[PDB]
Design a protein around this nucleic acid. Sequence first.
DNA 1: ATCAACTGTGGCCGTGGTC
DNA 2: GACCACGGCCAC
Length: 747
Amino acid sequence: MILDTDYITEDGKPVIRIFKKENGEFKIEYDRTFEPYFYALLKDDSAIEEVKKITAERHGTVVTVKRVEKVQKKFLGRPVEVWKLYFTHPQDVPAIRDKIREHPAVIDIYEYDIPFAKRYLIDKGLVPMEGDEELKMLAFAIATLYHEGEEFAEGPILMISYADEEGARVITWKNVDLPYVDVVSTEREMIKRFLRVVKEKDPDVLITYNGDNFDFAYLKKRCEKLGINFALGRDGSEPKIQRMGDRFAVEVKGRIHFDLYPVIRRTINLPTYTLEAVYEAVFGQPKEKVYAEEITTAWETGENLERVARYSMEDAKVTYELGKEFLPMEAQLSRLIGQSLWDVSRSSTGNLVEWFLLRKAYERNELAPNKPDEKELARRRQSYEGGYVKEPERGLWENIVYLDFRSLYPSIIITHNVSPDTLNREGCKEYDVAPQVGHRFCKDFPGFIPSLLGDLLEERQKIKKKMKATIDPIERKLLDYRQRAIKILANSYYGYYGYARARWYCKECAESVTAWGREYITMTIKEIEEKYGFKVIYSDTDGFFATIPGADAETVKKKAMEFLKYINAKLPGALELEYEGFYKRGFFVTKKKYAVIDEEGKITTRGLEIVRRDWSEIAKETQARVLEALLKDGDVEKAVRIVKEVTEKLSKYEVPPEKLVIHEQITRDLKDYKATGPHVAVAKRLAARGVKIRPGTVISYIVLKGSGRIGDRAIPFDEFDPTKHKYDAEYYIENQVLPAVERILRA
DNA sequence: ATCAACTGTGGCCGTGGTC
DNA sequence: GACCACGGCCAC
Ligand SMILES: Nc1ncnc2c1ncn2[C@H]1C[C@H](O)[C@@H](COP(=O)(O)OP(=O)(O)OP(=O)(O)O)O1
Ligand SMILES: [Ca+2]
Ligand SMILES: [Ca+2]
Ligand SMILES: [Cl-]
Ligand SMILES: [Mg+2]
Ligand SMILES: [Mg+2]
Ligand SMILES: [Mn+2]
């Protein structure tokens, strides 16, 4: 399989490098014959002799058009000849493209901002991560000597650990007597020993956990202090530290640096994303956390270096086993998008959608539209109407079925051929008309994006079908992440229609999809109440909860399956209503907030404070206890005993102050806030101390006894000290616990 | 490193403002 | 005390 592509320049000329792994052998293929290009549409064919002569400049070297070639293509499905303008070097394209657009005989240019390495993969029809090839993988982690108030990486690395299928080992330059610790003389020898281990094991994948931001930058600083050529790349290069939006990412040429953190962060929802928490979340086994401050007094005193060597070895071991499980996911997503796993695992969703569309456009001989310029961008900032959300019939309900549409919006795009190249296209025999908003969509030929969503949905449903044939629970959970990731990707094609930066943008298409969605779900609700006598308890966009009031579980289930047959035979094309579960009891508080219990006593809760990252644990823990006493047992006297038992204790100061921490993210530069709530008030004070707040910083604070604004008496939970701070028992009772549990206990 | 960043809307609710 | 906008996080 192909791992990655890039290019280098030799004596002015690009050379594509393709990093392959075939038959257990690593190979670099070199391509010097593939040419960079973009396209120009001309007012007339005669003007090509002029456009051919346009020149630019690029660090003193004159940029010319190398050769041109006339090609027939489609733009939004409509045929058109354009001129493919070829250049000697990729960097010619940004140097000359504006001078070509500016030429009065040039109506427009296209595909002029496509990175050459990825251009190569698309035009060659090459897909990374294809084939039976078993990649060799190696995880690594580092233990560092930390002192608070020092510069980054001022202290040494104390241990480097790596793990793979042969096991886990720790390299260190302190005298640790353990069987997996290899002892060397200096920090420099330790790094050099790791470098040699990577060269000897020669892994295809290097796995870290946040190595994009920590491990590699630390290594780089130490190698700079120590005079070490950190030649981890298969071509002898050092790790290449690239900028990616607000943060960094690191590549190792010839291998795949799979940083697990961005992948895990986007597919599992957790309170904290410590390596320990993730490992517990995925496998169910506990992993211990030795702290950067237990580490530092252990190294200076000699004691408990073996416990640190064990925490370092565990870090590498779990990092490996995690990468073992998640690589198939990202290798499949990499195969579907047609780009490298390094890129696909790190990039925004819109960008994946678009790289997928550029490849399909190439395969179909469709010219790509350009990104919007700043004028068009400002024009695309109108919003539109979305899904329908019924106000729930509040309270407790028995024998509830949950019926839900299979991939609704993508199904609508497929069924009604909803796409920019079919919108109000004249001349067709057949049209579907969007309700409320009126846009017409031609049905005579598949639309570009409609013809792509079907293979995605098919892929997802096969994964779900295979989820049904496997007994292994961990393997079933990983299959669950994969099909959910495809669900999100397919739905992002719909959102992409409304995305101001999209090339194939189409706000008519996006509001047509939602309008069809409101039509289908509300027709389904009317159908199930009028023909079958159900009562729709609650509904959100494409599914609903319903019961036959007074009927037992068997009757509600049988009559629910009857309705599905009826409705699914009325529904056209790819629309399909699905049976998504039966619940013995349910409690619906407001829109988006409810909890149900299945016929096994497993509670599923949605939107309620229990699941929110920004409510205090004491509040979440109490509402969880109230809910469980409420839906499992029919014990209203138990729930009320729990809240009163928590009121006292908080008032008596008997509840641990760790359960009162509020976590809220900073999302912008602190100057740009217009409303200063408690998490901003704490963060602005940190900024005044030189703590360097940035978007993404989580404020973890606690509220102390007082009466002013809440931000006035909030401090970082760091600075909490029981000898000196009594917390605000009245705040945590009247503003955190009681509000949460009372909205439930109103019924 | 060469663009990439940031798929869409609906909705609750605590906070700290105005009036 | 009535009301409303901001901001964060969640459900689709
Ligand atoms: N993350 C999202 N981005 C954009 N639109 C979304 C997203 N999540 C949901 N929607 C929209 C499009 C969905 O088809 C519709 C209904 O949501 P939902 O029931 O969760 O998903 P679904 O119908 O695509 O999948 P499933 O087959 O699992 O029910 O709401
Ligand atoms: Ca060469
Ligand atoms: Ca049907
Ligand atoms: Cl760009
Ligand atoms: Mg569903
Ligand atoms: Mg749904
Ligand atoms: Mn659905």
